Design a binder for these strands. Sequence first.
DNA 1: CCATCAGTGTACTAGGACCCGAAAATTGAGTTACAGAAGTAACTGGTATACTCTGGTTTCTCTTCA
Length: 160
Amino acid sequence: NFPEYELPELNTRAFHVGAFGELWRGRLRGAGDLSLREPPAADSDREDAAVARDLDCSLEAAAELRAVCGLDEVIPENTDLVTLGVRKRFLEHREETITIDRACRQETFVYEMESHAIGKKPENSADMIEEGELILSVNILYPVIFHKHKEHKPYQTMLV
DNA sequence: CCATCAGTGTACTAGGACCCGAAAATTGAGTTACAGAAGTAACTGGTATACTCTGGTTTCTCTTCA
């Protein structure tokens, strides 16, 4: 069944997870969007033929699209935008209020827990997961260990 | 040079009042009984602080004997 907001922005209606995964794998069935492969002049011609086949255009038009839509750090930042200006001001104020300016232990902790296993390939390739496996991001609320854990409920999230 | 030892830069508590909304509960009117208790709303004595002549007083010349 379709997941839809039961509450405006807090909660969905009860829906079967298997049905939802099947809807998704049905709408992406054999479209090449669920690959789980790593990202890889002769290929240019095949790509242009594919674009001509999928967009009903000419090989010349496909090559033109491939050329024009091409992709289009350095800490210096000038000629700012709104949020870029806010970031510049924040950076300058931090440069004068802080003396060591390195990632706090909680920042590195949250990051190194989040990005602990990303792109980690299976050693066996027999425990490789199938294309389309519906990872659920549960988060289990810690019990009330400290008294203040009633106010702001700490949780640990698991990618089931 | 590897010991030691403040500071530091933060999310994570610790008290510490305080607030926001929801849900339950009450209040309120309407009736009609019921008995009795509050709850004012009414006339009717009762005794004191001024008060107003008044009864006595007081010299002060005189009245009446003596």
